[PDB]
Structure 1
Amino acid sequence: ALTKSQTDRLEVLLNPKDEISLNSGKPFRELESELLSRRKKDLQQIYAEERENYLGKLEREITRFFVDRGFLEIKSPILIPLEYIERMGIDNDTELSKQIFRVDKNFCLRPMLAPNLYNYLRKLDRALPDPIKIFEIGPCYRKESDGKEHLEEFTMLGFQQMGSGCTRENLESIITDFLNHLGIDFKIVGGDTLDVMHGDLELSSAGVGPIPLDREWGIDKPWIGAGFGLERLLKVKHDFKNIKRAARSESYYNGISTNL
C-alpha cells in the first residue's frame, strides 16, 4: 500500500485530466515514473507550441474583453500609501486590517484595487465624457490562513463605471457576458451588494454606488463595479484542486509540477 507521503508526491504530479487509479495495486515507483513521463511531455508540448503562461494569457484575454467594451486600461501602483487602507474604512474591526503586508513606515502592498480606481475615476471625470469606464488587472496581496482557495500573492481584475447607466441590470450584464465569454459557470447571488459564485467559491464581489464611502474619495456620482480573482478563474476553468496550481509560482507552470 502507498504511504500518505507517497500519495502526496503522486498528487503533485497528477493533473485533473489524468485518469489513473492511485489506489490500485501498482507500486509507487511505477506510478511515479508514469506521471513524471506525462508531465514532462505536457511541458514539452507547451514549449513546442503555444509557450504562453496561463496567468499572462488570461490577463491578455480579459484586457481585450474590457477594452473592446469601452473600458480604459489602467496600470496603477502596487505599493500604495498606507493611508489608503484607513481611508477605505478598513479599521481594526474589519478582517482586512490584519491582512496587510506593510512596507517601510507609510506604505503597504495593495490588498485591493478600489483606492486606485476611485482616484482614477475622480481625476478622469475632469476630462472624459460620461460615463467613465475603467479597469485594472494586477497583483494584490493579503495575509491568509492556509486554504485551497486563497493565495497570499494573487491577481485581481477590478472594473468600475461611473455616471449614467450604472444600474444593477447593467452590472449583471457585464458579469454575465464576461463569464460566458470565458466559459466559466456562475451564479449571481444578492448601495446594493452582489457576489458571483461558482458553487461555494466566490469568484467576485460586486457593488452599486453611491455609498457613503465615496465622499472621502471625492466621488459623488453613481457607479457600478466588481473585482475578480484571476487565479480563482483559472482554478475553475482548469479544475485544479488547489489554487496553488494557478499562482505565480516556482512550483507549477500552467498547473504542471516543475519538480520532475
Structure 2
Amino acid sequence: PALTKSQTDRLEVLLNPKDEISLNSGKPFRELESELLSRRKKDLQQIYAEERENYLGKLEREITRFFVDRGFLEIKSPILIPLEYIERMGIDNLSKQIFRVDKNFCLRPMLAPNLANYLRKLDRALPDPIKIFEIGPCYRKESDGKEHLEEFTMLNFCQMGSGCTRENLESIITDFLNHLGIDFKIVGDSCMVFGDTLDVMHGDLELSSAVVGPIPLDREWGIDKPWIGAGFGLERLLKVKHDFKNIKRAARSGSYYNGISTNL
C-alpha cells in the first residue's frame, strides 16, 4: 500500500536527520508513524532529562560569549522600530517584505539601523575602534521555502574606525565560523541597500551578507568613519549544524523543539 502525500508529509515531520528509516519501503503507514513517534518521544525525554537548553537560545549564548570575549559590546535594541528608519536606509517602495505595526512603526527586517545609531552615539565616548554586536529577532514577509522564515534571528556584528578592511572582516568571519565548525566560502554579491556585499556561503546556502564601508548611506546616519559589518541568520547556522532539511526545524515555533516534532 503506497503512501499518500499527506502520509509522506506526516512521516517527514516525525523523521529526524539521524534516522535511517525509509518511507518508500512498503512498510504500512501506521507502523512507520508509530515507530517514529516512539523514537521522538524518547528524544524529548532525553532532552528533558539531560539537555534542557533550547537550540536557538544556546547558540545565541555561545555567539554572545565569542564576541564579548573579542572586545565587542553586546547591544539589545528595539524590535519594534520607526517606519521612518526604512526609508532612511534607502529601502525604496525588501520594502514589500516589511511587517507594518499601526501607522508609524514596523517590525525590524534587519539590525543595521539600530546598530548605526549606536556606532554614531558611542563614538562620542569610546576609544577607537568601536566594536558592537546584536543578536535578536527580525521579520520579513517571504515565500514559503526551505531556507526562509518570516520570523528569524539575526546576528550583526560591526566595527568602526581602525581595522575596518576587507581583510579584517574576512578574518573575523573565519574565526567565527571556525569556532562553530562550519565550512564556508566567500562570494561577491550585490544588495539594493548596501551595494556590493561579501556573501558567506555554505554550499548553496547564504549564511551571511557582509559589507566593507564606507558607503554613501553613511551620511544619512551620521557615520563618517570606515566600518565593516556582517549579518548572519542563526536558524541557517543551526540548519547547517544539524543537517535539517527545512529551516522550520530551527525556528521559534510551537511545532518543533530542538528539531523534534512536538505534534506527537
Please, what TM-score do these two structures have when normalized by structure 1?
Answer: 0.98
CA-to-aligned-CA distance 1:163-192 (integer Å, 9 cap, x gap): 001111100000001011001121111275
For structure 1, list consecutive stretches of 5 or more residues without a partner in the other structure. none
- The superposition leaves residues 97-124 of structure 1 with CA deviations (integer Å, 9 ceiling, x where unpaired) of 0000000111000000010000000000
What does residue 191 of structure 2 align with? none
- Name the SS of the counterpart of 1:192 in structure 2: strand
CA offsets, 1:108-154, max 9 Å, x none?
00000010000000000000000000000000000011111000000
TM-superposed CA distance for 1:26, in Å, is 1.2
Cα distance between partner residues in 2 of 1:29 and 1:192: 52
Which position in structure 1 is the counterpart of 2:106? 108
Instruction: Give secondary structure in 1 for the equivalent of 2:23.
Output: coil
Deviation at 1:66, TM superposition (A): 0.3
Deviations 1:239-259 (A, max 9, x none): 111111000000000000000
Q: Deviation digits for residues 176-230 of structure 1, max 9, x if unmatched?
A: 0101100112111127520001111110000001100000000000001000000
Query: CA–CA distance in 1 between the matches of 2:168 and 2:139?
Result: 29
TM-superposed CA distance for 1:25, in Å, is 2.1
- Matched residue, 1:171: 169
After TM superposition, the structure 1 = structure 2 runs for residues 19-30 of structure 1, keeping only pairs within 5 Å, are: 19-30=20-31
Gaps of 5+ in 2: 189-194
8 Å CA contact retained: 1:192, 1:209: no
For the residue of structure 1 that corresponds to 2:207, the secondary structure is: strand
Q: Which residue of 1 aligns with 2:44?
A: 43
Q: 2 CA distance for matches of 1:199 and 1:231? A: 16
CA contact 1:158–1:228 (8 Å) conserved in 2:
yes
Distance 1:199 1:244 in 2: 19
* SS of corresponding position for 1:203: strand
Number of equivalenced pairs: 257
Q: Give aligned-pair identity as a percent.
A: 98
Alignment of 1:149 onto 2:147: yes
Q: Deviations over 1:4-28 (max 9, x none)?
A: 2111110000000000111112111
CA drift of 1:235 comes to 0.6
CA RMSD of superposed structures (Å): 0.8
Equivalent-residue separation in structure 1 for 2:183 and 2:28 (angstroms): 38
CA contact (8 A) 1:71 1:135 kept: yes
